[PDB]
């Protein structure tokens with residue numbers, strides 16, 4: 621079947637975040653694709669957080685599996701957290717570096733969408 625690709629998202633890092641008023645940001649990420657939802661740990665009190673996580677989505681429908689969505693959240697340990705911003709990309713085959721400009725600050729990451737063997741093209745349809 622066509623449209624299949626191995627998706628891996630990695631190299632997470634943000635800068636100039638402002639999720640709190642009296643302390644530095646307590647950031648964590650949510651990464652969405654094809655019904656899958658990965659979550660990073662919280663980097664407490666840092667406005668330039670980095671995550672070592674490498675998310676293996678395995679084989680997904682690159683063409684119809686919706687957008688790759690990255691949400692940047694601040695953690696307020698008093699229950700309700702803050703959505704600092706969200707990024708949407710339509711993944712293409714190959715290695716790509718992404719920069720999402722949030723309302724305040726930005727998040728950077730990379731993803732690799734490797735077409736399954738005997739498949740080729742931007743979304744592995746050929």
Ligand SMILES: [Ca+2]
Pocket residue numbers: 639640641694695696702
């Ligand atoms: Ca907050």
Ligand SMILES: [Ca+2]
Pocket residue numbers: 640643644645646664665
């Ligand atoms: Ca904080």
Ligand SMILES: [Ca+2]
Pocket residue numbers: 639640645646694695696697
């Ligand atoms: Ca917080």
Ligand SMILES: [Ca+2]
Pocket residue numbers: 695696697698699700701
């Ligand atoms: Ca909470």
Ligand SMILES: [Ca+2]
Pocket residue numbers: 696700701702
């Ligand atoms: Ca809050």
